[PDB]
Design a binder for this molecule. Sequence first.
Ligand SMILES: NC(=O)c1ccc[n+]([C@@H]2O[C@H](COP(=O)([O-])OP(=O)(O)OC[C@H]3O[C@@H](n4cnc5c(N)ncnc54)[C@H](O)[C@@H]3O)[C@@H](O)[C@H]2O)c1
Lengths: 364, 366
Amino acid sequence: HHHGRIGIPRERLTNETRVAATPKTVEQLLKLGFTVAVESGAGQLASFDDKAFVQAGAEIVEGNSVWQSEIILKVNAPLDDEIALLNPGTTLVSFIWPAQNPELMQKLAERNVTVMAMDSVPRISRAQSLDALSSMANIAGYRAIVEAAHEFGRFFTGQITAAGKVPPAKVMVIGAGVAGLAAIGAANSLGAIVRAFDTRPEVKEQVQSMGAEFLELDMSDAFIKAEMELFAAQAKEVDIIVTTALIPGKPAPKLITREMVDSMKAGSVIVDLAAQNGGNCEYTVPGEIFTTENGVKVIGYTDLPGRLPTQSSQLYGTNLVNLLKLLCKEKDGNITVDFDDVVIRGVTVIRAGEITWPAPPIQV
Amino acid sequence: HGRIGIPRERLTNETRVAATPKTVEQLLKLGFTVAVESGAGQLASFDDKAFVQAGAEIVEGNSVWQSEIILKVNAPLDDEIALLNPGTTLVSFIWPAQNPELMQKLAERNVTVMAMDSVPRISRAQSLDALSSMANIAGYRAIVEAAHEFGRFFTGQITAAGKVPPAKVMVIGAGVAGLAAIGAANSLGAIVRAFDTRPEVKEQVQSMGAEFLELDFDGYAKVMSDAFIKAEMELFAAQAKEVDIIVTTALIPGKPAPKLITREMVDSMKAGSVIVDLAAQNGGNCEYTVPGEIFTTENGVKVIGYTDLPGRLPTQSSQLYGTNLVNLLKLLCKEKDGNITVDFDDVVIRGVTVIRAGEITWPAPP
Ligand SMILES: NC(=O)c1ccc[n+]([C@@H]2O[C@H](COP(=O)([O-])OP(=O)(O)OC[C@H]3O[C@@H](n4cnc5c(N)ncnc54)[C@H](O)[C@@H]3O)[C@@H](O)[C@H]2O)c1
């Protein structure tokens, strides 16, 4: 028996580099009164070796041995042959995406387990410390710029050289949510001249506070036309475009057309952070870099957080710790679900074998 | 005529070009005409039409070699040497000391050759110093390469998912490349540390935000003694245990690079550290380095030993290098004339000129 033990399995999803705990989060989990079993090699792709987990106080296990834990933390939802190894009474925490996965939901319910979906955390301010989506979008903004710099053939950073002045790169960020603000931030660190647009005017003051230009137009379309004319104008002026625009519950809006890209200066780069939802850019090939005929690199990776695995695992694993701080107020290795707390109600999609998703309507 | 020819570089995998549209404008103001071989700027993102806009003529195949002046990045390959016609002035990297066969073959064609690697490393020549331009780019690019391979934030920050410390960066060697690396790592918010055996650079390193590392301890003899070398190795072993990124730049042309970071030191680093070895072309300052590749150690260190860092910033390298050439030419062509005077009283021209009218004139006097 393994009450109060958390099992951290190796991620089985193709090309996943992240892990749901790091040596550091493990020290934190033990402070909450749990024990931790990590499956051998779980952290290798994220640069956390077996020995560092053992040094943090975890036990390395080999088999399905990790599944004999009372609690399982993962990045991705379990596959069929994992689901069958979940014992009754187990609490599983991972990304689930219940709306897009009704059969997964039924198979978990049948194991008589509790499930909290890290995608279903309500976006209220007190829940920010558990919000994995913000965590990942933040990494992705940062990484977007790291990829852009990697692919770009000029200095990002302005500079006085004996062989001439070099101007700074000009970067347009589309969407100044969590990812777009991270991208602004990264680009600023490299000394770029940054411009941003968002439809939500309330971000104006954060964007300008970062030394970036908040772009203005000349809603509900024909607002789109003035937005597209802005992006067409900007596309001929800038070197780098980072596009991050999603609308909850929809495909990704085409904001950057083939004609906009075609007008850009050769050697320009586009990082399309909405690629997994189809991309903001018409040239985007999800999963790849596409190079246009005029010499523009369109970056469409769908795994920017997995291209920064150590940092992603750290922050995600902190998200899970912070969720467990809610569930284990006494620090005694025991989980208590409180449906009066709207945060816990949001996140809990199965409770001991009963589907509890969707949560009652909330005001975010 | 006074025509300058810019060939496409044919050394396998070369991405740089000896002129950009911007430098072609400048070439013309000096009284020259310019032909660019089609496709020459492509890999550096300058297509034919961008060269024509600038006032250059596009030509195909070997017509480019029928110019009074040839500007290249790399030395002519074997089937390019024959294409040099007598009285032509060639300007490129040559590395005479390390290629006497090349030097003989060029001499027969009865050309004048100027090796960009032979520019006297002095005050009045820094606007012409291609080795400096290329090192500066390489230092900056090293850190882009480090960031690409690194699995953590470079930049400290505070998220609701917690506080992330900055990356810690050690730069070995604070010449041109090392300082460029210090600057890019500091821009990214790292804690940057730097060692150089020359104490004069301390204030330079410090002014850019970096800690100047001191040893637990004439100058030439001090730096070669067993005692100093044991103390320097000791410093590196200790830093390797605590930093995330090491950039090594200790490289002398034609000499094999000193092994400053041993297998043992790398084996002590935190998993996911990155080493960028800018001495890889001469064997590397790190014992794990595999020149031309990234090598991953058993303990999860990425040892980056690409030898072509300026060609992984091709647009920038072509722009600056082409500007160095423009500047050589301003010095060869004082009356903005279309005509070149190889004035041997100017020490910089004396230094760069390694063949003249078929006579090997390298090496220049002290
Ligand atoms: N309370 C908090 O402390 C907090 C913190 C972070 C996020 N959140 C919440 O999470 C939710 C989503 O997070 P997000 O802000 O990263 O958004 P997001 O990821 O859905 O999209 C990124 C940005 O794209 C923008 N966008 C959409 N269409 C656009 C268009 N056509 N042109 C330009 N921009 C466009 C959005 O307005 C948004 O700012 C929001 O409800 C937010 O309030 C809350």
